[PDB]
């Protein structure tokens, strides 16, 4: 059975006006901003942004990529699908 979102999942995260996008869910790092309550800090692969988004809008991505994880002309969306696909856990800093 499902857990709580935790740091290192991997997602498609929602976000109005833009397809569901490859992202995972990032670590606080010390000293860093903290999300709002039941919100979740969301890094977005391909794009490398950062928002702060509730379980509503993000999809695990195992179960999701079949529908989700097809190319997209948007800005960063291929990038993003590479990321996700082969070094999910990488720094992009």
Do not use: C
Request: glycine share 8%; hydrophobic share 30%.
């Amino acid at each position: 059975m499902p857990h709580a979102f935790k740091p290192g999942d991997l997602v498609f995260a929602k976000m109005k006006g833009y397809p569901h996008w490859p992202a995972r869910i990032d670590d606080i790092a010390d000293g860093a901003v903290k999300p709002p309550p039941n919100k979740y800090p969301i890094f977005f692969f391909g794009t490398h942004e950062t928002a702060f988004l509730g379980p509503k809008d993000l999809f695990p991505y195992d179960k999701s990529k079949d529908k989700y994880g097809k190319p997209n002309k948007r800005k960063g969306f291929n990038e993003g699908l590479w990321e996700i696909q082969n070094n999910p856990h990488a720094s992009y800093s």
